[PDB]
Amino acid sequence: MSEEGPQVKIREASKDNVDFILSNVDLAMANSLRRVMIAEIPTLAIDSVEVETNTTVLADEFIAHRLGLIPLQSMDIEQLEYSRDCFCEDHCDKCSVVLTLQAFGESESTTNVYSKDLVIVSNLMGRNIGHPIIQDKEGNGVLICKLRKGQELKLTCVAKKGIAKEHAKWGPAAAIEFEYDPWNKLKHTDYWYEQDSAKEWPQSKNCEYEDPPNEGDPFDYKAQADTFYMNVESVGSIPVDQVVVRGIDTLQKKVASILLALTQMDQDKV
């Protein structure tokens, strides 16, 4: 209870999923928040890959794409500057993280290469970034490639900050569930049916949090959408609560930038 505007009510909390109900908010703000959480949060991911030796049965572009799709820790992504905004030549410790991967095939059986084999060689300067995200019980990670005896894979990667709009590999959220008005009280949709509508259409799991419609009642034309049920799932780079906070912060930053541009141009034109 901070201000009479939007309200929240968390139904479930977890390290990978968060369930909450938005109240006293409009459809536009909820949709903007969903879009920002989908494709606006900065994240650290591998951008450029240098292949030194590749004797495997996989093409260099294949391994580069697979490495670029590997999630990386981005807890302290706010302390890393953009590559284009840096004064260096190509990359440095203050704007990028360098990772090196070396693999060789010694055992007769197939030797798998996992994301845990990546080693950070740059100086993080105490920042909590660059560590590959491991969530498997065995603690192996993402399978990158498989090698047999006599094959070697040596290469070096550099990680750079980016947003999901530029490339899908920078997305921190996997899938976001958005739903409102479990019953058709607002008549925002028409239900396709053959003989019956209630029987043919299954009831949503959120129907228990709202009062069922009363038969023989006039259609409420003064009612708008104000309650939204949202579920956010994180890939693992950023926690779900931090994902939501960063989404709100990014939306606020965009609005503030628009206001600043308007004020600056008003001052210049006057």
Partner: protein, 111 residues
């Protein structure tokens, strides 16, 4: 090869500005504002907040083409009310609502 670069949809280039207001001669006290490098994310919010105002007689936005990340916003306000003032008020209200939402979410997650 004719693939546009992926950073042209969110990065300002050279010679163009984020905002551009041009007066509209079709109706009195009406202006058209062009936004560069954003679309469909804050335009809907701005239109909704402008419609929430009582001194705004018209508020709409459109995207000419999905290829280019830009949209045009048209605001018509009552006599004596500058559309820029309405835009500033809508932005301030959005900022306040977002801050309140963030504070409430943090408070709820703390427990």
């Amino acid at each position: 090869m004719n693939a546009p670069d992926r950073f042209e949809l969110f990065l300002l280039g050279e010679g163009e500005s984020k905002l551009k207001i041009d007066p509209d001669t079709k109706a009195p006290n009406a202006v058209v504002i062009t936004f560069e490098k954003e679309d469909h994310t804050l335009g809907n919010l701005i239109r909704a907040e402008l419609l929430n105002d009582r001194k705004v007689l018209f508020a709409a936005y459109k995207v000419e083409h999905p290829f280019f990340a830009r949209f045009k916003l048209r605001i018509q306000t009552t006599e004596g009310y500058d559309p820029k003032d309405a835009l500033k008020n809508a932005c301030n209200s959005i900022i306040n609502k977002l801050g309140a939402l963030k504070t409430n979410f943090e408070t709820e997650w703390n427990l």
